[PDB]
Structures are given as C-alpha cells and as structure tokens.
Amino acid sequence: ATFEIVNRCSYTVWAAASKGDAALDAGGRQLNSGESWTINVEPGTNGGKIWARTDCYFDDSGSGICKTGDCGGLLRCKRFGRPPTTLAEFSLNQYGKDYIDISNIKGFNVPMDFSPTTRGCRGVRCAADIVGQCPAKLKAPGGGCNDACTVFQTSEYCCTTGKCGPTEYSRFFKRLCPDAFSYVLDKPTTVTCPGSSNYRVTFCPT
C-alpha cells in the first residue's frame, strides 16, 4: 500500500513509520514545510503507526533526539515513539479489509488528517488546538499534550485491568477530537476501508 505523508505545518517535522518491532519503509525522514514523503507499506501489515516528531537534532549517522515522538534517538524509527504523539494507526488486509484510526491515547503533538486516496471509505482528522488548550497537568515541557496514562501511571488511566471508564482527561481529548480514540476502551472510531487502499497522512491539515 502507498502512504503519502505530507507536512502542511509551517515547521519541520520528522515523520516516523513503524510497526513496533521494525521500521516501515525507511522508518523516518525529515519533512520541511510542504514536503511530501511517499512510503510503501507491505500488505498485511498489522499495527502500523505513523507520527510526527518535533524539534529533532540528528547527526550525520541518523542519531539524535526529538522533543516529541523520539524513537530511541534514531532518525529511522524501528520502534514506536515517546509520547506525546498523535497517532495514525492502521492494520492492512485483515480478512479483506483495512482498518484506520487516529488515536490520542498516547497524547497529541501535531494535528493530523488520515484519509484514503482510493475510493470506498472516509478519512479521520484531529485538527483542534489540543496543545493550546491542554490541561496544565498534561502539558509536556518539550511541546505537546500528554495523555493521562503517561503522566499518572494509574490502572484507571492506563486501563491496565481491561476495565476503565472515561476520565476528565480523556474527555478533554474527546471533546476537541471526537473522531480520535481518547482512551483504551473508547467507543471505536476505526474506519473500515477496502483491502489494499492507499492513504495520505497530512500533518497540520487546516
């Protein structure tokens, strides 16, 4: 499947793409404002994520640090990134269907639209100013708005027992971005698309 990753933000982001135990395609790249990066994701990829990282410094070996979404100090991510990270999530070719969502379960750093470029389903977006409105206790100094699980590490926020409800914090994310997951057991906002769809992830869509 092809994913075009577009940075519409006015600032540079460093895109990342991983399935947790491996890079997808090159795994990461710098995107200046306006740049587009086209990656190929193997059919049948399960549990892929794309995110933006902000305020990164990397040396000529591709080693360094980002203030949001850092994936163990690498430009080319093999692993998932450190919160806060707005997440585009997908599982492809799962019994004939692709499943896509945006998630705020690991917080929010950059607004995002995640849309098919082929026919047969709708996209999802979380484009509100979550960082600006972020509750004081969830504000990350590096930038971004952390989720409550990351900050407080309780069973309730992290849904460790598999039983948990919405919280004051999850409801903040949900009020600003209804079409994104706000906690682990949120009513799913997954979109079902035809198997083998292609997609575009746009940072700062509006």
Q: Indicate the pairing of strand 97-103 with strand 180-181.
A: parallel
Spatial distance between the Cα atoms of 7 and 201, rounded to a whole number of angstroms? 9
Q: Which of 51, 45, 104 is nearest to 81 (CA)?
A: 51
Sequence letter at residue 137: K
Q: Are 7 and 203 in contact (CB under 8 A)?
A: yes
Spatial distance between the Cα atoms of 49 and 99, rounded to a whole number of angstroms? 12
Beta-ladder partners of 63 = 74
144 contact partners, CB below 8 Å, separation of at least 6: 54, 67, 68, 83, 84, 85, 107, 108, 109, 131, 134
CB-side exposure of 125: number of CA atoms within 13 Å?
Answer: 13
- Distance (Å) of CA 66 to CA 46, 53, 56, 133, 189: 26, 6, 4, 22, 29
Beta-ladder partners of 102 = 88, 180
Method: X-ray
What's the token pair of residue 123?
Answer: 């996209």
Q: Which residue has the tokens 């047969």?
A: 120
Q: Which residue has the tokens 């499943």?
A: 99
Cα 139 from chain centre: 18
CB-side exposure of 52: number of CA atoms within 13 Å?
Answer: 30
Burial class, 95, CB count within 10 angstroms (exposed 0-12 / middle 13-18 / buried 19+): exposed
What are the residue ranges spanned by the domains of the chain? 1-206
Q: Which of 8, 11, 113, 7 is nearest to 56 (CA)?
A: 11
SS3 for the chain is CEEEEEECCCCCEEEEEECCCCEEEEEEEEECCCCEEEEECCCCCCCEEEEEEEEEEECCCCEEEEEECCCCCECCCCCCCCCCCCEEEEEEEECCEEEEEEECCCCECCCEEEEECCCCCCCEEECCCHHHHCCHHHECCCCCECCHHHHHCCHHHHCCCCCCCCCHHHHHHHHHCCCEECCCCCCCCCEEEECCCCEEEEECCC
Superfamily of the domain at 1-206: Thaumatin (2.60.110.10)
- Distance (Å) of CA 30 to CA 25, 26, 33, 57, 172: 14, 11, 10, 10, 30
Q: What is the resolution of this structure in A?
A: 1.7
